[PDB]
Amino acid sequence: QTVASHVPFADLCSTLERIQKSKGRAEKIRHFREFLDSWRKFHDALHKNHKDVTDSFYPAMRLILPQLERERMAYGIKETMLAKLYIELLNL
DNA sequence: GACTTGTACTGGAACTCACGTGAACGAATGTTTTTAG
């Protein structure tokens, strides 16, 4: 029962947007700490009858720090390819 | 990982203000000593 299955991507996107918008490092750290605390509290409340489940913050941590992603190889779609694919798919 | 550039935060020093302490000069007054009439 992974926590990421119950956490919408919109919440993470909003947290990242708030972090970027904030000017002082204190506000960014506060936002990230609030998100992490909510995630940890939800994880603790979900896995009550647990057996040392291998569920952690990796699903969100990898997205927050894509540069450290080693499990997944190169996507093969760079900025030019992404722009092209957006053009065909959206039928612009 | 080491260097460079750029941005943000922050505690200490500079400045000012105000007061207290001590030292020096001159004004005004009072008082004492000495000397010419």
b (16+ CB within 10 A) / e for A26-40 = eeeeebeeebeeebe
* Cα–Cα–Cα angle for A54, A60, A61, rounded to 5 degrees: 85
Which of A20, A19, A60 lies closest to A40 in space, CA to CA?
A: A60
Distance of CA A25 to the CA centre of its chain: 20
**Chain B, protein-covered positions (CB within 7 A):** 8-9
Protein-strand B interface by C-beta, 7 A? A 23-25
Cα dihedral sign, A34-A39-A40-A45: positive
CB A4 within 8 A of CB A60: yes
Q: Is A37 left (phi over 0), alpha (psi -120 to 50) or beta?
A: alpha
CB A15 within 8 A of CB A35: yes
Experimental method: cryo-EM
